[PDB]
Structure 1
């Protein structure tokens, strides 16, 4: 069935007004996504911070439209070393972070340009593009190594500062998070080992699934739909893109949005409002 994301709640439980708008988007080809007017959508959405995953673009090839973003002038990029046109993530912020780092401090997992870490006054932001386990699950084993090291790294981060984690985490946690769970138990993104890995992550850091925390009973809410078989217009999708929050930020949480109508990728953007 179809899904309508409800209006933006821009007030916290405490009645405090949202001060921080973070948008996260798996763009699936930075250059293509801009040709399909993704930065126009971004300007209308006007986030303080924009996290992009799967840029598929080296730094020397960053398109010039990026220099047309006066509200997002601090930009940080990470691409793989060995593979061209693979992975890649970006983080663009209105204000300069205090510190910016790359990867998770484990060199087995820091080759593919998948993680940026941006520290602010009140919180640390991680945007992540999590390794897909691949058709035939040819990478599932590597991805369980990833989940383990990433979990550990995130736990250490949250132990010093409130943590926001956003991006394409390449798992539908529960049956409610995809349209066809029964048919997908052996496919990338809904294996038992990926679902446990995400459950372990929520329990160990610990972190809350912001969307879930606010809409526990809401099915049909997805962020990815295959380009094939007209899946998007049928809403045959998966919720793969999350904002995961340190529990201390839940009093600051105003809303966690799924921007179902924003085209340009086989993922849609998600948007977090916080009262900081």
Structure 2
């Protein structure tokens, strides 16, 4: 069936108002996305922090439209070392961060422009574009090394500040997070190993799955539909884009959204509301 994301809850479980709006979006071609009216949608959503994944754009080519962006003044980018046109992430934020790191501290997993870390006063925000297992699972064993090292790094991080992980994690955690689960159990993003990986990330750091925590039996809620076969029109998609929260910040959670109606990519954007 189709999905209607419920209205935005901007008060916390204790009725404190939301102070902080993090929107995250796998833009699948920053340049294509900007041309497809993507930045207009960002201006009207008006986040405090915008996280972008799969920018597929070097720093040189970064379109002009982004310098204009004024509520998202501080702007951080990471693209791979030697593979041009591939992967890439960004982190734009209204307020200026205390510190910005690139990578997870592992030479092996830091060559593809996938993670930005941003320390704010109350918490630390990691935004990640996780590597796909590949068509035919050619990268699936790399993905298991990634998942284990990314888990270790994130456990280390969250032991020092509360942690918001956002972005495209390239796995549908459970059979509710995708429309055709039994047909994809051998495909990238729903192998037992990717799903086992996610659950270990949830129990190890630990982190609660922001959206599922609030809506644990809502189905047909997805972040990505393939461009092929009119899949988005039939809403035949996957939940790939999460906010993963330290349990500590669960009482700061106001709401976690899926912006199904925002076009511009093969992922819709998700949005987090915190009282901080």
Same fold flag (TM > 0.5): yes
Superposed displacement of residue 68, structure 1: 1.5
The separation in 2 between residues aligned to 1:209 and 1:250, in whole angstroms, is: 10
Ranges of 4+ aligned residues in structure 1 off by more than 2 Å? none
Q: Residues of 2 paired with 1:264 and 1:206: CA distance?
A: 33
Deviation by residue 1:79-102 (Cα, 9 ceiling, x = unmatched): 001101000000000011000000
Structure 1 residue 66 displacement after superposition: 0.2
Q: What is the CA–CA distance in structure 2 between the aligned matches of 1:148 and 1:86, rounded to whole Å?
A: 23
- Cα deviation per residue 1:191-245 (whole Å; 9 max; x = unaligned)? 0000000000000000000000000010000000000000001000000000000
TM-score, reference length from structure 2: 1.00
Give distance in 2, aligned partners of 1:217 and 1:102.
Answer: 35
* CA offsets 1:137-173 (integer angstroms, 9 cap, x no match): 0000000000000000000000000000000000000
CA distance in 1, matches of 2:207, 2:219: 21
Q: Distance in 1 between matches of 2:70 and 2:109?
A: 33
SS at match of 1:175: coil
SS in 2 for 1:41: helix
TM-score for both structures, normalised by structure 1: 1.00
Please report how far the alpha carbon of residue 122 of structure 1 lies from its aligned counterpart in structure 2 after TM superposition.
Answer: 0.2
2:109 counterpart SS class: coil
Taking only aligned residues, the RMSD between alpha carbons, in angstroms, comes to 0.3
1:105-162 CA distances to partner (integer Å, 9 max, x unpaired)?
A: 0000000000000000000000000000000100000000000000000000000000
Q: Where does the alignment leave 5 or more consecutive residues of structure 2 unmatched? A: none
Aligned to 2:67: 67
Hey, what does 2:162 align to over in structure 1?
Answer: 162
Q: Does 2:123 align with 1:91? A: no
Q: Give the unaligned 5+ runs of structure 1.
A: none
Query: How far apart, CA to CA, are the structure 1 residues paired with 2:160 and 2:249?
Result: 13
Q: How many residues align?
A: 276
Deviation at 1:67, TM superposition (A): 1.2
